[PDB]
Amino acid sequence: QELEKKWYALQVEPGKENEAKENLLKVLELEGLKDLVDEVIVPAEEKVVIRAQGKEKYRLSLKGNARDISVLGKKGVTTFRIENGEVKVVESVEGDTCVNAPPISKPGQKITCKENKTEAKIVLDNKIFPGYILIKAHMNDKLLMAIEKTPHVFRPVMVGGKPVPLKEEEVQNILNQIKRGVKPSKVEFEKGDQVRVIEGPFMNFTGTVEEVHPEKRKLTVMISIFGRMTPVELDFDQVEKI
């Protein structure tokens, strides 16, 4: 078989992750190291942002099934097509030559339709761990020196003055993290739930949840103070379902 490569987190200048990646690739070329590296990734998600006369209309993942998107501009309609990680103008108003513009595929890139006043640009969103890029490679001294000599790159994460490998799962999870649509913080507590106050002056009294407040972690509980129904504001952590 073939010797497997490992993942390593590099440390680079925040906000220039894409630049550091481009820089690195170029350096791998000149130093004849390209074969030691199978991947260079910026922990983020590429997205297409479509605008119409200043206003943002859409923000969609670059990756996905072929999709067409039409937007009303000044003079009329412009339709963009996103497929195979590229974006182009399918058709725009009379006069817009953007329809001939070659498809874009990299962050920072853009196609503008001056007539319809429409445009689509590739950007990066969900960029967690800014100031880091990930490379799958076969580490060695030359590669290291090359990484360190690359403009906008500091050096890989060092443990014992030596690059430290990441687990495939760690990386995969990071990538899965990058691109999922963060559902609600669970739904423990919903109107009607019967609870017992476990902390504070209302401790041991029971009642029912009248209104939840997920974005504040508080509840409006109608507490039965021995029949004397009293609505009280409590924190999720000072009551218990029952």
UniProtKB/Swiss-Prot annotation:
Keywords: Transcription, Transcription antitermination, Transcription regulation, Transcription termination
InterPro entries: KOW (IPR005824), NGN (IPR047050), NGN-like_dom (IPR006645), NGN_dom_sf (IPR036735), NusG-like (IPR043425), NusG_2_sf (IPR038690), NusG_dom2 (IPR024045), Rib_uL2_dom2 (IPR014722)
DNA-binding as UniProt keyword: no
Record Gene3D superfamilies: 2.30.30.30, N-utilization substance G protein NusG, insert domain (2.60.320.10), NusG, N-terminal domain (3.30.70.940)
Highest taxon of source: Bacteria
Pfam families: KOW, NusG, NusG_II
Domain KOW: 191-221
GO cellular component: cytosol
Any one of the GO BP annotations: DNA-templated transcription termination
The keyword Thylakoid belongs to this UniProt entry's keyword annotation: no
Domain statement: Contains an N-terminal RNP-like domain, a C-terminal element with a KOW sequence motif and a species-specific immunoglobulin-like fold.
Family: Belongs to the NusG family.
PANTHER family on file: RHO-INTERACTING TRANSCRIPTION TERMINATION FACTOR NUSG, TRANSCRIPTION TERMINATION_ANTITERMINATION PROTEIN NUSG
Function: Participates in transcription elongation, termination and antitermination.
Subunit composition and interactions: Monomer. Homodimer.
Name by which UniProt lists this protein: Transcription termination/antitermination protein NusG
Species the sequence originates in: Aquifex aeolicus (strain VF5)
Gene symbol of the encoding locus: nusG
